[PDB]
Amino acid sequence: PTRVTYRRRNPYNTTSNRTRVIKTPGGQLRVLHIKKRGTAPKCGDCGIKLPGIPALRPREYATISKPKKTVQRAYGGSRCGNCVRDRIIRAFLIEEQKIVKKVLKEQSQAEK
Amino acid sequence: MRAKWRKKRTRRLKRKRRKVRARS
Amino acid sequence: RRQRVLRRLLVKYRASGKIDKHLYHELYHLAKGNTFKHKRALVEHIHR
Amino acid sequence: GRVIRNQRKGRGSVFTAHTRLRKAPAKFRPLDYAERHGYIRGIVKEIIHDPGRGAPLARVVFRSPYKYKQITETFIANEGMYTGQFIYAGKNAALTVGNILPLSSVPEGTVVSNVEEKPGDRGALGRTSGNYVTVVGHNPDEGKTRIKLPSGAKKVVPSSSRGMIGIVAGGGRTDKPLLKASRAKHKFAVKRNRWPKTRGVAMNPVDHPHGGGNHQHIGKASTISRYAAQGQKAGLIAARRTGLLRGTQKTK
Amino acid sequence: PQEVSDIKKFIEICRRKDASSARIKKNPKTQQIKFKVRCQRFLYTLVLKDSDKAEKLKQSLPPNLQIKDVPKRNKR
Amino acid sequence: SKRTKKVGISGKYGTRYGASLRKLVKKQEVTQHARYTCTFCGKNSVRRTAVGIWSCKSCKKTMAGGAYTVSTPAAAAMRSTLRRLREITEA
RNA sequence: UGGGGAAAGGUUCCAUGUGAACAGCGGUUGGACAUGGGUUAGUCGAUCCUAAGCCAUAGGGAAGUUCCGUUUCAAAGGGGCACUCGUGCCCCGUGUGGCGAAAGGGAAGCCGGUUAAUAUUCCGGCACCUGGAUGUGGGUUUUGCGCGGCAACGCAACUGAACGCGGAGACGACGGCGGGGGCCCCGGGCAGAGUUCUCUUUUCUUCUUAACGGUCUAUCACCCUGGAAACAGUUUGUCUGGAGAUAGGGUUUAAUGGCCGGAAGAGCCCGACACUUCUGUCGGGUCCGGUGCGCUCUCGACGUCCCUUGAAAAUCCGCGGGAGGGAAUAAUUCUCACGCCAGGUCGUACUCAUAACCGCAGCAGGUCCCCAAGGUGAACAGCCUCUGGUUGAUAGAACAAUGUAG
RNA sequence: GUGAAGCCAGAGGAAACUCUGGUGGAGGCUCGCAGCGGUUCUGACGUGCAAAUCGAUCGUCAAAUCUGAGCAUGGGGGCGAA
Ligand SMILES: [Mg+2]
Ligand SMILES: [Mg+2]
Ligand SMILES: [Mg+2]
Ligand SMILES: [Mg+2]
Ligand SMILES: [Mg+2]
Ligand SMILES: [Mg+2]
Ligand SMILES: [Mg+2]
Ligand SMILES: [Mg+2]
Ligand SMILES: [Mg+2]
Ligand SMILES: [Mg+2]
Ligand SMILES: [Mg+2]
Ligand SMILES: [Mg+2]
Ligand SMILES: [Mg+2]
Ligand SMILES: [Mg+2]
Ligand SMILES: [Mg+2]
Ligand SMILES: [Mg+2]
Ligand SMILES: [Mg+2]
Ligand SMILES: [Mg+2]
Ligand SMILES: [Mg+2]
Ligand SMILES: [Mg+2]
Ligand SMILES: [Mg+2]
Ligand SMILES: [Mg+2]
Ligand SMILES: [Mg+2]
Ligand SMILES: [Mg+2]
Ligand SMILES: [Mg+2]
Ligand SMILES: [Mg+2]
Ligand SMILES: [Mg+2]
Ligand SMILES: [Mg+2]
Ligand SMILES: [Mg+2]
Ligand SMILES: [Mg+2]
Ligand SMILES: [Mg+2]
Ligand SMILES: [Mg+2]
Ligand SMILES: [Mg+2]
Ligand SMILES: [Mg+2]
Ligand SMILES: [Mg+2]
Ligand SMILES: [Mg+2]
Ligand SMILES: [Mg+2]
Ligand SMILES: [Mg+2]
Ligand SMILES: [Mg+2]
Ligand SMILES: [Mg+2]
Ligand SMILES: [Mg+2]
Ligand SMILES: [Mg+2]
Ligand SMILES: [Mg+2]
Ligand SMILES: [Mg+2]
Ligand SMILES: [Mg+2]
Ligand SMILES: [Mg+2]
Ligand SMILES: [Mg+2]
Ligand SMILES: [Mg+2]
Ligand SMILES: [Mg+2]
Ligand SMILES: [Mg+2]
Ligand SMILES: [Mg+2]
Ligand SMILES: [Mg+2]
Ligand SMILES: [Mg+2]
Ligand SMILES: [Mg+2]
Ligand SMILES: [Mg+2]
Ligand SMILES: [Mg+2]
Ligand SMILES: [Mg+2]
Ligand SMILES: [Mg+2]
Ligand SMILES: [Mg+2]
Ligand SMILES: [Mg+2]
Ligand SMILES: [Mg+2]
Ligand SMILES: [Mg+2]
Ligand SMILES: [Mg+2]
Ligand SMILES: [Zn+2]
Ligand SMILES: [Zn+2]
């Protein structure tokens, strides 16, 4: 039932002084200071968390290899994939509608 | 990747190239 | 506690095959209302 | 005596405006060549609420006719606008809710909002929740348009002024009672330091012109002249009449 | 600390420029034998359950680096 | 098992603020906490977020409406007027 | 009335010695007097970034000390390359200062031992981050810049300049519910101790496992087949479904979960021998289950309230685009494994209060936080106890009046 | 402690709609510890522990509650639920 104390000079509970209780091989109860929890990146359009990418603080992403930070397809990061399919379909149909519109206007109205 | 990361890599290649020219 | 006990029993009966889904769904809403006092009262109603 | 309360508010020390939570002001785009001769369109990204105001704001994204980038804007949202809507601005824009087109290309009888007093000042008139202005008639020669303001007054503005079709969202905000002292405090705590407010009759003669006495009373006529020295204007200023409004009001 | 799964690559580790030393610890109670080597960055550990293969391993590794026995109650 | 005769939702106010004032606020509270059918997806899930903002919980669309109602009679009357005026005059 | 800190104090901390003075009585004792000694960091803070706010520059006022002004009626900046040699060329340009947080934002250290007095710093063992240089192994290529899966996506690597888009940093209060660590509680076993007129297979204590890595797994959500009214699935709390439910099979965010390393060689508890001391040596043990509206911290999915909707910047990553560059005997701008070098400056002792701060003082006053055992009980109520801490407030004798308290 | 909307089941009626038992957890609601405040005894002390303290009894206690550091307003001026 031993009580514990901080190990740094900050005595306040201020969302940056995060602790957890551990038991040591010497049979004592100590306090171990820990960092904050990373957040998973979200999607560009819909706003849901992308699968296959870990959640870390913004600085740790500089030490990890490229294949662990992306997904092998167009717009690998920042886009969920459901939205990527929508972009492919939407882009194709719009241009097709442009072809018929210009032929209809150029032919049926400039025949004279 | 940040600029300092890219500058270091291209600076390395320049050093390697000059040594080869000096040797040959 | 009582709601968990009744709901757990109904899942067991449906999977084994003692009752089908049509009787299961009706009993589920009957249990949500204050109909069955305890586990014994529910199984007795199933037999009838 | 000392300096009375309403004289101190001009020094701007404690009675300033809280602006930490406000992101940007609400304006139109600057008048440009594309919007003077044709039209351009933009997407509505978000409908957001900013503190200290009704009339929820809308964020719109336009392109750049001269450079490879896009610019985001901030308008006041008319009732009926929705996320993802295409809205158009220019001289030849269609006449639908949410569009922005010069006041000349508008038939009489339509309601608009955020009207420019002069072409290019980005919105001055009719920009409060549930308010609008109405066009009355045109003068095609020496182009000038008659409009009717929410207070009832009539005004003449140049024919090139702009306005956005519809009615400012927010509806009937001021119908339900505040009903609680706390609710009034929350409303004003994000605007200014003006709550609560003390009656001048309960003060002392050194503090306010209404002053003290053995009974709480004013002691002299409460209507103050139009040209009086600062520190004297405490009451009904330049009142034309007074009392309960029985008949109809001739002024329009 | 890092496991070495098999015998083949453990001797490969010991044949390195920065392999400073090595030691042997044996646990009689659980009938287990552990081989440890100290490199520049990590301390690789190899675990053997049998005792016969231990003798062959001791002599196969290069003679340059030292080998110790890790007695009980190491002095402070 | 009705728990109230006439007070209704405004029973949280107890015996304060006077009978008449509670009636006016009840008129406006009832219509803002309800749910409305979405005009785009058709599901019955649209709820008020801010003083003049309503959003669908299913298709994620966001629309600006009245203070305590999705639309106001004045705004509704204007769409018909604007539609009728536009299509006869220019077409 | 315990164990540690912020503000403030400044040697009060530790050892040896001591006549007077001070400790409202005494004094061999002391926070007093005299002489010596004590505070070690690439990882803990400051240093970096901005908030409310303050002050230079361009300009305008004032006889003047100086007042206003912070992007404003300003010709206001920085990037690359090559030359024997610095002094010669070539692009881009809307914008262009500093100060301001030891509780906000933020690259990186854990266990054991040690001193009369310091340690996440010193010693031993085992790790990590940033910056700068370079070589071997493996990868790719004669189809010049990798393969697999229907799919969500996977793996040890697997070109990417100008300009552009997006994400993380980045955020309210309250309510019930579920998972994990620590503590408390119950049963059995091995050691040592207390009690014993009588009873008690009895009562009490010890039985521990860090950072950092490998491997197998855990709500939400997402993908493939198929096509639902006798409507079904389902939460303590009615939400979900032809905009594709139930059901069957798969992928993935999230360990303070299991096992292995680190690691028993450590720490702790018993037993048997040694002796001026410098000094010790050698034996054993260090397990197995159960329980819950329990207490505390943390994570996740839902819900309620608003005329209230609950900061910014430095910093880091992915993508769109296709500039430039490059092998057939090697070349290589491979974010993969291992290896080489370096990390400056100031604070760190002690108290944090019925004696170390402020009240004229060793003053019943005032002064911001962290950890939180057993029993009775609804309970952080009151009353009793264990760990740890005090036994310090001038004393001896007698028991009238009048008092203060019960 | 009290138990507002929303939801589930049963019963009555030609209909409009009404009854009964549960579920849920709203409110400048309520009893009451720590904190904050300061009603009565017109108690203690009144060359006091104290140039405002001490004891018993009391007001509020999830919200217009209590509080630390950083910055702003300077004397005929500031600030003021007065
Ligand atoms: Mg590509
Ligand atoms: Mg870039
Ligand atoms: Mg204006
Ligand atoms: Mg005020
Ligand atoms: Mg008043
Ligand atoms: Mg008075
Ligand atoms: Mg006067
Ligand atoms: Mg007067
Ligand atoms: Mg009166
Ligand atoms: Mg201490
Ligand atoms: Mg002494
Ligand atoms: Mg004395
Ligand atoms: Mg003496
Ligand atoms: Mg003495
Ligand atoms: Mg001392
Ligand atoms: Mg001294
Ligand atoms: Mg070093
Ligand atoms: Mg640090
Ligand atoms: Mg520095
Ligand atoms: Mg700077
Ligand atoms: Mg100045
Ligand atoms: Mg000048
Ligand atoms: Mg600074
Ligand atoms: Mg900090
Ligand atoms: Mg070290
Ligand atoms: Mg060391
Ligand atoms: Mg490095
Ligand atoms: Mg090679
Ligand atoms: Mg790319
Ligand atoms: Mg913050
Ligand atoms: Mg728990
Ligand atoms: Mg217990
Ligand atoms: Mg036992
Ligand atoms: Mg372990
Ligand atoms: Mg464990
Ligand atoms: Mg399934
Ligand atoms: Mg082990
Ligand atoms: Mg041992
Ligand atoms: Mg031993
Ligand atoms: Mg208990
Ligand atoms: Mg707490
Ligand atoms: Mg210290
Ligand atoms: Mg303390
Ligand atoms: Mg004191
Ligand atoms: Mg207790
Ligand atoms: Mg109990
Ligand atoms: Mg208690
Ligand atoms: Mg003490
Ligand atoms: Mg006496
Ligand atoms: Mg007496
Ligand atoms: Mg008496
Ligand atoms: Mg209350
Ligand atoms: Mg007090
Ligand atoms: Mg008195
Ligand atoms: Mg006296
Ligand atoms: Mg008192
Ligand atoms: Mg009494
Ligand atoms: Mg009481
Ligand atoms: Mg505050
Ligand atoms: Mg003066
Ligand atoms: Mg004056
Ligand atoms: Mg004077
Ligand atoms: Mg006040
Ligand atoms: Zn998406
Ligand atoms: Zn919808």
Side-chain angles (χ1 to χ4, degrees):
Chain A
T2 69
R3 300 164 273 197
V4 300
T5 61
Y6 284 112
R7 300 168 79 168
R8 297 165 183 197
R9 292 270 173 189
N10 186 355
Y12 301 114
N13 188 359
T14 61
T15 188
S16 162
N17 189 359
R18 285 163 64 79
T19 63
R20 83 189 188 78
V21 171
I22 67 154
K23 193 132 58 165
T24 187
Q28 291 291 354
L29 271 175
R30 293 181 184 271
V31 161
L32 183 63
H33 288 240
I34 61 172
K35 304 304 184 89
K36 279 185 265 192
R37 284 178 53 80
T39 58
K42 266 67 171 185
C43 175
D45 298 333
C46 62
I48 77 160
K49 40 175 75 167
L50 311 166
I53 294 90
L56 315 165
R57 312 298 310 185
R59 188 71 182 271
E60 307 152 281
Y61 285 105
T63 70
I64 294 184
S65 65
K66 192 175 172 93
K68 299 172 178 22
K69 281 176 310 198
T70 185
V71 179
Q72 286 301 131
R73 84 179 149 209
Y75 297 83
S78 65
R79 310 301 167 173
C80 59
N82 272 3
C83 296
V84 159
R85 181 180 50 99
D86 284 348
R87 287 193 189 233
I88 298 196
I89 278 161
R90 198 194 300 269
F92 163 66
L93 293 170
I94 290 276
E95 319 281 329
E96 289 292 336
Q97 192 57 330
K98 222 161 287 185
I99 301 299
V100 298
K101 190 177 297 178
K102 71 165 294 302
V103 176
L104 188 153
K105 184 178 184 293
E106 173 263 334
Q107 175 178 355
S108 296
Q109 277 78 16
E111 81 285 349
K112 59 192 63 62
Chain B
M1 295 299 291
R2 73 279 191 192
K4 291 174 70 175
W5 189 85
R6 293 185 290 230
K7 291 174 70 175
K8 161 153 182 196
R9 288 175 59 100
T10 184
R11 166 168 67 240
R12 183 177 178 179
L13 166 76
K14 185 177 180 180
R15 284 179 192 265
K16 176 54 73 203
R17 207 153 281 171
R18 68 180 65 252
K19 299 298 293 295
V20 172
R21 296 291 185 269
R23 185 179 294 275
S24 57
Chain C
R1 290 179 180 175
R2 187 210 300 183
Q3 270 293 305
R4 293 198 174 115
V5 161
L6 300 185
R7 284 184 191 170
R8 216 190 299 118
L9 168 68
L10 281 172
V11 176
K12 182 187 279 317
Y13 271 26
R14 182 190 66 213
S16 75
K18 291 206 198 53
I19 63 190
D20 63 358
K21 65 182 181 180
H22 301 99
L23 187 55
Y24 162 85
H25 193 108
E26 181 206 320
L27 283 169
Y28 195 101
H29 286 288
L30 269 168
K32 201 173 190 315
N34 197 4
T35 306
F36 309 122
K37 291 174 70 175
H38 39 76
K39 185 177 180 180
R40 155 159 67 79
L42 168 62
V43 290
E44 183 178 1
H45 181 279
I46 288 173
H47 298 154
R48 275 201 296 280
Chain D
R2 51 165 45 110
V3 159
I4 76 179
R5 173 183 57 219
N6 73 69
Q7 290 190 247
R8 307 202 262 116
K9 307 213 170 162
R11 316 172 64 245
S13 87
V14 176
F15 314 90
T16 45
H18 310 92
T19 48
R20 171 179 61 114
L21 295 167
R22 309 181 194 226
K23 260 53 179 191
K27 301 162 177 312
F28 288 158
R29 302 173 68 254
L31 203 51
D32 50 335
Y33 173 84
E35 174 188 343
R36 272 193 276 121
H37 292 46
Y39 66 90
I40 48 182
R41 65 179 176 88
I43 297 169
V44 177
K45 298 293 183 182
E46 293 179 353
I47 304 295
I48 71 161
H49 160 243
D50 71 331
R53 198 203 286 210
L57 270 62
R59 212 164 272 155
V60 190
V61 168
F62 294 83
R63 264 178 60 221
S64 158
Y66 319 100
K67 185 177 180 180
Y68 178 70
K69 64 174 181 143
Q70 48 195 48
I71 304 101
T72 179
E73 286 298 335
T74 316
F75 300 157
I76 299 182
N78 267 354
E79 184 160 346
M81 281 171 87
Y82 61 88
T83 295
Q85 184 178 2
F86 284 131
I87 65 147
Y88 302 68
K91 168 159 100 65
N92 295 349
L95 193 153
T96 56
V97 171
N99 283 2
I100 292 162
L101 73 165
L103 201 63
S104 73
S105 296
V106 175
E108 304 95 332
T110 70
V111 302
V112 295
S113 163
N114 211 49
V115 180
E116 289 192 292
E117 291 202 274
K118 281 164 178 46
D121 78 318
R122 290 132 78 77
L125 307 156
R127 41 195 278 149
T128 300
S129 75
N131 279 327
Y132 51 94
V133 303
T134 313
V135 304
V136 164
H138 307 254
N139 290 318
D141 297 329
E142 61 87 20
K144 291 182 183 294
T145 313
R146 281 181 303 286
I147 60 185
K148 158 153 168 152
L149 297 178
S151 70
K154 293 182 183 293
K155 199 183 196 328
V156 175
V157 307
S159 161
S160 304
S161 185
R162 300 183 284 177
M164 191 194 75
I165 310 294
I167 295 175
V168 186
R173 168 165 47 72
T174 64
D175 315 313
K176 56 184 288 199
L178 285 164
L179 195 84
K180 270 213 295 189
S182 171
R183 301 248 188 113
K185 169 186 223 282
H186 283 308
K187 165 186 199 182
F188 290 130
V190 75
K191 289 168 150 181
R192 270 164 320 269
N193 186 335
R194 68 176 308 288
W195 201 87
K197 197 168 179 176
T198 309
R199 275 182 304 123
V201 184
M203 304 175 122
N204 279 308
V206 56
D207 310 337
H208 204 263
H210 291 180
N214 283 355
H215 299 281
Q216 282 204 29
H217 72 286
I218 293 180
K220 266 160 176 292
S222 167
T223 45
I224 310 303
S225 158
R226 182 67 178 172
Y227 319 81
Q230 287 69 240
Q232 270 177 328
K233 290 199 211 176
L236 319 168
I237 289 170
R240 293 178 182 90
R241 64 160 304 281
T242 288
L244 201 59
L245 277 171
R246 299 292 179 90
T248 187
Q249 293 329 108
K250 206 163 209 179
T251 69
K252 64 196 85 65
Chain E
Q2 275 191 4
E3 301 292 326
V4 169
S5 65
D6 63 358
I7 301 299
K8 181 62 69 177
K9 64 182 181 293
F10 181 82
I11 62 170
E12 182 65 26
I13 281 176
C14 288
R15 201 166 306 135
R16 283 170 64 190
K17 300 289 94 176
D18 69 84
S20 87
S21 66
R23 42 174 172 282
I24 291 166
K25 164 140 191 55
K26 62 179 72 175
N27 296 115
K29 184 178 183 292
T30 187
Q31 295 297 289
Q32 184 178 182
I33 293 191
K34 302 191 156 172
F35 272 72
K36 308 173 189 205
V37 59
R38 179 65 203 165
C39 297
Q40 162 62 228
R41 180 173 168 170
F42 285 116
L43 172 85
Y44 304 95
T45 307
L46 161 70
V47 166
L48 296 169
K49 182 68 176 177
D50 187 74
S51 311
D52 290 343
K53 295 185 290 294
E55 182 65 26
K56 277 74 69 177
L57 183 63
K58 186 183 287 185
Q59 63 84 30
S60 168
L61 61 83
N64 190 359
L65 75 165
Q66 295 298 109
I67 299 284
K68 277 74 69 177
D69 287 356
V70 179
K72 277 74 69 177
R73 269 87 57 83
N74 49 345
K75 270 76 181 169
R76 179 66 65 192
Chain F
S1 175
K2 183 175 174 66
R3 308 186 303 219
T4 49
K5 167 148 166 187
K6 65 179 73 175
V7 178
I9 175 178
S10 85
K12 68 217 206 189
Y13 295 131
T15 75
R16 319 186 272 283
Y17 319 123
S20 179
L21 276 182
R22 285 195 256 106
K23 288 191 46 143
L24 282 72
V25 66
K26 182 175 73 175
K27 183 178 184 293
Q28 295 298 109
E29 293 209 322
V30 163
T31 181
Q32 66 165 344
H33 292 137
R35 308 163 76 111
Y36 305 80
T37 80
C38 178
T39 315
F40 301 89
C41 74
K43 300 201 177 84
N44 177 70
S45 70
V46 168
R47 294 178 65 88
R48 146 164 187 260
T49 293
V51 69
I53 298 170
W54 309 73
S55 60
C56 181
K57 184 178 184 293
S58 304
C59 57
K60 288 310 181 323
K61 291 293 201 102
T62 318
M63 185 180 288
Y68 314 128
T69 312
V70 176
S71 66
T72 47
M78 183 278 288
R79 292 188 296 272
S80 53
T81 286
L82 188 153
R83 184 179 67 189
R84 195 260 321 167
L85 187 153
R86 181 187 68 244
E87 60 87 17
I88 59 157
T89 292
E90 308 303 322

